[PDB]
């Protein structure tokens, strides 16, 4: 039962990359990856290797493929104590999942700030450019279970946990800059309509239903985020090529009492990418766990995800001077009118060990501030103030969730609570109350101050009676959604149009897809005609007539909230298939090859069986995948060398990777006689952009490749893919 | 008054094809299908239509759109109980998932004998061919959580509750006449092997990596029901279109004391019937929910799953 | 700082007798004690002095005084994130009570074996002298909740967890050497009858009630325990001074396979001594906790509670040799038919840290074995060996309860369980199954063998139909009850009687008294007309003429059944009232104390008020407790030493406290004057034996007290104490 | 929600009203209550967003709040008419 002779059961412990070796547990993966969170792990890490297999009771175990019976074709004894504890703990496995964002992938790495921050903010993890911070970042989906796929249409968490000096602080965010609803009040109506309805819980994953869809018509303030969603924001390429938001309106409070507004954003360092709608449902069945492999890979290549945390910094006297309210969450602030301050670099750089106990115990909270942070009035944050610290208790089983390893402080923690269920920590202080003399007030209270401080909250003013009232000033919800669509390239606001109506095509009653495009009306004539064509729906003469909202502040656009409109393009870490022939000519191989490891882009050697096939020196090219097996969707580019072509000329599968990966607009590239699959994708002889073609594979010709991959997709060909059957 | 004046917002009550309306819970689109488990659970159903909103405590609430806070534009007040009733039970929804068959699709119906099996068995259930039998069923994969998809390749449950008048009798099957280990204490092994990998949490729904095979390889006991598997039985059409058996000899006793082993068959009258890979795993894609899906609508629609 | 400036605050870190110091945590205490368990601990004890107050994430708080609000006098508000982790954790501390037991006191040990044992056991905690293993030991009530009085009637649950090098091995037994049931199928029916009645529950810590009696009457299996209850052994005076035993017969297996039937039995070293009943009731009101405080106090005192483990050993082959079967829990073995052999010693000596992480949390299991001991078929203990898996899950919050450091194995544990609530154990092993290629297969199942091997179960013979029947051979009730009430002296005789008479006194409705009776009749003639008398039954002329059981393979008693019959007493840990006055006689309380300290006896000095008196000489007397606040219960003698005799001569507390000692049948000496209290008890001028008295404490004064100490209390007294009113 | 298993424990029976409580809160650990309602949330048009909100009133009517002034600043400060 034993590991093959040769070795190869075990991954090497060195950056590969990906599909070159199984993949690992991260402290096996990467031994001398450290940093001071994973390290003060090592007090639970477990080993396995010449160990002896025991109960959890340290006793050894000599048969663990029978149970204890009375004959050996008997019935089962009762005291077979070994059987009774192994089948208990697997019973006792599962724990509920999150009841949003239940869907997640995680991994270790650290941040450190690029200059001292002292003069805005005391933060200590913000107070010196060589003091580093270790992480634990969770992405995720929001609505679907656990188990459900990766790459469907939803909003991301983008939640990142930071081991500080001073205290754990949790910045709890998004992918898109602003939330669905105002109030808090209303997160259990707005969840409960875009998960799957109650009486035959369907759908997962998707926002695409009746009940969704009748909340927003009833709701305009949803839809800005709706925008977001419908757009390619929705479909990310990768965690790697998305935004980060904390959305909500923070403070940061300086060792003077200064109080300044902020909000947080992350920069991917790998650039902004989305998949296009096709091809990310297609891809829920082909590789439900696109994102979290994805991800898990990237780390193990050496292609650490890393992201800029930005600030948009408001003076507390700048408050009012926005024609929108700071502390409306549907609201974003334009980066034409506030511009991002570059604050530091986050680097992810190991895969947790066990996804169980790192990754689905990490418990996040928005409420998990430091001293020289603070809150506002935000009506959505202050709810989520409460609802994180309520749903762990009964989520992680108990109030000692921060004993869990994932969660635990690594700076000291001290104080006067005792017990709670699995409690850990054997307190050895006679006093378990202040104020007490019997430990002389031990632990004691700490004053504020500029350094090591505890914590006090900024003295805001609160003057108002006690009322259940939104603000007036929140009521304003079309202005935002205008900014947003005038902002996106013509292709993304196609798209859009596109997000819209496949998912009102899934509204069974046709009131409610009525009532919408009534809203989107109230947006833009030009996004609300275009939708409503392709429902069979006709505006009425008043719908045509609907004022257009107002500018924001005088904006009639802000690049920055496009996906595209400003390149920033970045092809490390990227994925091209190479479709094999068996006479590859080797000559064009080497060339494809050097030429993408000089950029950092990963190479899948596919064919239509597994194996090896040899090349025309004899070279043995083992095969990852077939054609079938790993599809275009998983690649960002094509590249069929040249061979004996007649080898697979009229295979179907191959043909058909050809014309998926041209519909879902990435770059193909042809060498030699792989030249005649431009038949296939039925397309000029003088050739088209987004198409390279040459009689080999030269420098030349992989640096139109790479250039083009660089842009990500070739958007100028969406007039072309309407006619291709595929 | 959201609703549309044409009504159009709710379903008609009577059996209607798939797409033709809303989908809607069994007791409203259907409430002249009654049996005595469904009437019986009519003290903990619970209407809405004419009443007012209210606490889980019975105090009407005035303002469901908003927090109690010091100033339209101020912070949340510890005070409002409504809000923190309201978020509590919505923190606090979810239990945990099956730890296998996580991902399964029920439905009510009845069960009637076709003559009294007495001289085999004592049962009261299978007495009397006037007898009618209350059950609930539950189609599920194995594998995957309650969001993982329907049409993936993994064997299937099959269980189904028979409330008789001598106790609930669970029949609690798959759809392959045999399983892919010997003993019970390897299932732990079994399904850690099958189910995602420890490290990654990869794959969802899916045999396909290293640690099955693995397993497999070591162990010929898992060759039959891996047949099954690989064959187009891992990917059923429809619930209503596969097999059923309890894989175990179970004993009949009857009156007399004497037993007989016997093992228990599911035959569907809608026939058998299989996607095809390719099929079944872009399915997955497009309608992960489409055998849950195919079933409701089959009821509604007056297709009812029957098995012998 | 709130200290005082004389460091009294803090309990010396170094052995003082009861009273002496405030109590403390063991780790504190007493620093220098240490063993395997204790030092494995360290990683999870959590200091406080010099630290700040913090949240559980670490941050500082600056006032731990106040919640946030708008204003001073304003509303609280949600954003306190301060208050809601400090009130949340406050809110979950609570966990399920043990279901059974659920009042017990526990502490750290160690066990060594005399010799190697490995002639017929391979266990490996008895394989040396050498080898010593920690323990961790709780003793307990049965029946109260936690938070019931310790000096009830019930039995005592003590249980051994040994932290072994092959494995934890739970011994879990009870005071007495049998139970009261036969089939684990009845417990439910057997506690729910003697706990709280379910319409009111009343009562607590009690089996005085109707349902107790009613199942015992309709149950004659339970009679035999009954009677261990109903006699003194229901009452122990600590801990301490009480016998243990496993009950069931288990196996030995020696390393050629060979089983051996054993019972285990515990021996206190400091002698077996129980209370009196109307003692016993009084001090569950004066001091409920009087066992739980006397077990921590001896333990500071270095009184270390020490057992001997001892083995009764019967060959496979003498299976049937005996009247009665090894497997029915109700049945005793005899010590004269099969001796006890000494195995090992077991010593407390140190206290916990925090009494719910190390005490309330840790859990014990009879299933818990090692290599070299193995089950039996005894109906009882194969159900016992399902609930306590089962129980634990609920009670401690699922199925990683063997992480809570108190229950953690100090040897190594390695399997392919994984998650569960609360899970602590990082694994990181590829492999989460076996058997598996990918981690070579490790952890590896072990073959059995001498040491270190794997867990085989001994291959007994099973032959038999499926049937839900119990075995003729346990169907004899009477004998064992029967050979207990004869082994016993007539004092004890006497207490077994009034033990049945007061509790059937409250049983409400008379025909289970009077079927209780009958079953008494079937006993023993004599007892059940005692008890009849004691509450208006007659016997019937039928009750009358049945026939005695018969002996125990011919025995008509056997002493080791008696807790007196046979002097065992150590005076060591005992403690003596001294009762002062305002002008003590200094050369009298010399001697006293010279004496007690020499034997190990503590004192505690009383009087009317707290503070300090002043003896003739100058020597200023500190006050422990005045006679109300320490009465009579708490102590085992009572010495009155001369002085201004005047002082106390009409204080009615004082007069009382010698009053109920006298009751209790405690030695009391007297004085030079302090003879003046002889007319409180009535005692005749010549003096009575019991009654210490002289001019002076000495020549043989406290030689005459120690001696009488040594015999715990005056049983030929008991003909005098009902004519004093106390 | 710890001592008592859940957030249903207003559904133990020594617990429950007497008077109606219908709203759009769902599952939890040990359901009881059945909901037929083809709404879990309001806004909903395809229940005509029943159940319904009730204004304030002399009887019968919604819970409002006494609006209560607050004037002051977010302070952790014991008022000095306790001391
Ligand atoms: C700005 C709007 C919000 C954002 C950016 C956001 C973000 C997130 C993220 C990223 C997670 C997953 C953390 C993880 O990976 O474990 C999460 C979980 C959760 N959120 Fe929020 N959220 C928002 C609004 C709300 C609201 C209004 C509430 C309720 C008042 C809420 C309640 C919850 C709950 C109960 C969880 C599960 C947490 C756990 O089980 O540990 N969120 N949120
Ligand atoms: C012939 C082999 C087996 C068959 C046909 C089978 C069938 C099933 C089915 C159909 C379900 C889902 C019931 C539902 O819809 O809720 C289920 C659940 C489950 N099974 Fe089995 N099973 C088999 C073997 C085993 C074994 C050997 C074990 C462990 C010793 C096991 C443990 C479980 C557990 C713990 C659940 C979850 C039950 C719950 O949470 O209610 N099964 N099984
Ligand atoms: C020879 C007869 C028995 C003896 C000597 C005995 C002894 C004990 C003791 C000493 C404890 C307390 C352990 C501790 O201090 O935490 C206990 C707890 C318990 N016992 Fe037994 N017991 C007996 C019979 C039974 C039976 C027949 C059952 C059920 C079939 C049972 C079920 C339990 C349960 C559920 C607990 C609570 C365990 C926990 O919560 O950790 N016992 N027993």
Same mark, same amino acid.
């Given at each position: 039962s034993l590991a093959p002779e040769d070795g190869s059961?075990?991954?090497?412990?060195?950056?590969?990359?990906?599909?070159?070796?199984?993949?690992?547990?991260?402290?096996?993966?990467?031994?001398?990856?450290?940093?001071?969170?994973?390290?003060?792990?090592?007090?639970?890490?477990? #080993?396995?290797?010449?160990?002896?297999?025991?109960?959890?009771?340290?006793?050894? @175990?000599?048969?663990?493929?029978?149970?204890?019976?009375?004959?050996?074709? #008997?019935?089962?004894?009762?005291?077979?104590? @070994?059987?009774?504890?192994?089948?208990?703990?697997?019973?006792?496995?599962?724990?509920?999942?999150? @009841?949003v964002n239940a869907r997640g992938s995680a991994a270790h790495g650290y941040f450190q700030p690029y200059k001292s921050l002292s003069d805005i903010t005391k933060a200590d993890f913000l107070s010196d450019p060589n003091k580093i911070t270790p992480v634990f970042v969770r992405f995720s989906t929001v609505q679907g279970g656990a188990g459900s796929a990766d790459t469907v249409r939803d909003i991301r968490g983008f939640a990142t946990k930071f081991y500080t000096e001073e205290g754990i602080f949790d910045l709890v965010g998004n992918n898109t800059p602003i939330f669905f609803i105002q109030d808090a009040h209303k997160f259990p109506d707005f969840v409960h309509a875009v998960k799957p309805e109650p009486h035959w819980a369907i759908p997962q994953g998707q926002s695409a239903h009746d009940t969704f869809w009748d909340y927003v018509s009833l709701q305009p303030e949803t839809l800005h985020n709706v925008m977001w969603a419908m757009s390619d924001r929705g479909i990310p390429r990768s965690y790697r090529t998305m935004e980060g938001f904390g959305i909500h309106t923070f403070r940061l409070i300086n060792a003077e009492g200064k109080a300044t507004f902020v909000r947080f954003h992350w920069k991917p360092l790998a650039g902004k990418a989305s998949l296009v709608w096709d091809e990310a449902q297609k891809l829920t069945g082909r590789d439900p766990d696109f994102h979290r492999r994805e991800l898990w890979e990237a780390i193990e290549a050496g292609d650490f995800p890393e992201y800029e945390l930005g600030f948009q910094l408001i003076p507390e006297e700048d408050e009012f001077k926005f024609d929108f309210d700071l502390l409306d969450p549907t609201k974003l602030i334009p980066e034409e009118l506030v511009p991002v301050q570059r604050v530091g670099k986050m680097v992810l750089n190991r895969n947790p060990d066990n996804f169980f106990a790192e990754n689905e115990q990490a418990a996040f909270h928005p409420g998990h501030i430091v001293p020289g942070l603070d809150f506002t009035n935000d009506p959505l944050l202050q709810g989520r103030l409460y609802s994180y610290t309520d749903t762990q208790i009964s989520r992680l089983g108990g109030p000692n969730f921060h004993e869990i390893p994932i969660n635990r402080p690594t700076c000291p923690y001290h104080n006067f609570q005792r017990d709670g269920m699995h409690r850990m920590g054997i307190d050895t202080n006679p006093? *378990?109350?202040?104020?007490?003399? @019997?430990?002389? *007030?031990?632990?004691?209270?700490?004053?504020? #101050?500029?350094?090591?401080?505890?914590?006090?909250?900024?003295?805001?003013?609160?003057?108002?009676?006690?009322?259940?009232?939104?603000?007036?000033?929140? #009521?304003?919800?079309?202005?935002?959604?205008?900014?947003?669509?005038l902002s996106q390239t013509p292709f993304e606001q196609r798209h859009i149009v596109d997000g819209f109506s496949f998912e009102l095509s899934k509204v069974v009653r046709p009131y409610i897809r009525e009532r919408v495009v009534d809203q989107l009306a109230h947006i833009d004539l030009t996004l609300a005609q275009a939708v409503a064509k392709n429902l069979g729906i006709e505006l009425t003469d008043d719908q045509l007539n609907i004022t257009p909202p107002p500018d924001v502040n005088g904006l009639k656009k802000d690049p920055s909230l496009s996906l595209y409109a400003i390149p920033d393009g970045d092809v490390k870490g990227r994925v091209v298939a190479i479709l094999l022939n068996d006479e590859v000519r080797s000559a064009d191989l080497l060339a494809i090859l050097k030429a993408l490891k000089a950029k950092g882009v990963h190479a899948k050697l596919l064919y239509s069986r597994m194996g090896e096939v040899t090349a025309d020196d004899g070279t043995v090219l083992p095969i990852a995948a077939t054609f079938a097996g790993a599809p275009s969707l998983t690649v960002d580019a094509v590249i069929v060398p040249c061979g004996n072509i007649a080898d697979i000329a009229d295979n179907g599968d191959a043909n058909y990777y050809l014309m998926e990966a041209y519909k879902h607009l990435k770059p193909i590239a042809l060498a030699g006689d792989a030249r005649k699959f431009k038949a296939t994708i039925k397309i000029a002889d003088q050739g088209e952009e987004g198409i390279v073609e040459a009689d080999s594979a030269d420098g030349s010709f992989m640096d139109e490749l790479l250039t083009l991959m660089a842009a990500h997709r070739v958007w100028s060909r969406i007039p072309k893919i309407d006619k291709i059957p595929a």
């Open positions: 059961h075990r991954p090497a412990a060195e950056p590969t990359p990906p599909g070159a070796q199984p993949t690992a547990p991260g402290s096996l993966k990467a031994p001398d990856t450290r940093n001071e969170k994973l390290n003060s792990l090592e007090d639970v890490r477990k #080993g396995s290797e010449n160990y002896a297999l025991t109960t959890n009771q340290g006793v050894r @175990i000599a048969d663990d493929q029978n149970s204890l019976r009375a004959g050996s074709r #008997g019935p089962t004894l009762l005291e077979d104590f @070994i059987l009774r504890e192994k089948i208990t703990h697997f019973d006792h496995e599962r724990i509920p999942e999150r @009841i006093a *378990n109350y202040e104020p007490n003399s @019997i430990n002389d *007030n031990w632990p004691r209270e700490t004053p504020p #101050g500029p350094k090591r401080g505890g914590f006090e909250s900024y003295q805001e003013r609160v003057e108002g009676n006690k009322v259940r009232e939104r603000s007036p000033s929140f #009521g304003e919800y079309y202005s935002h959604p205008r900014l947003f669509w």
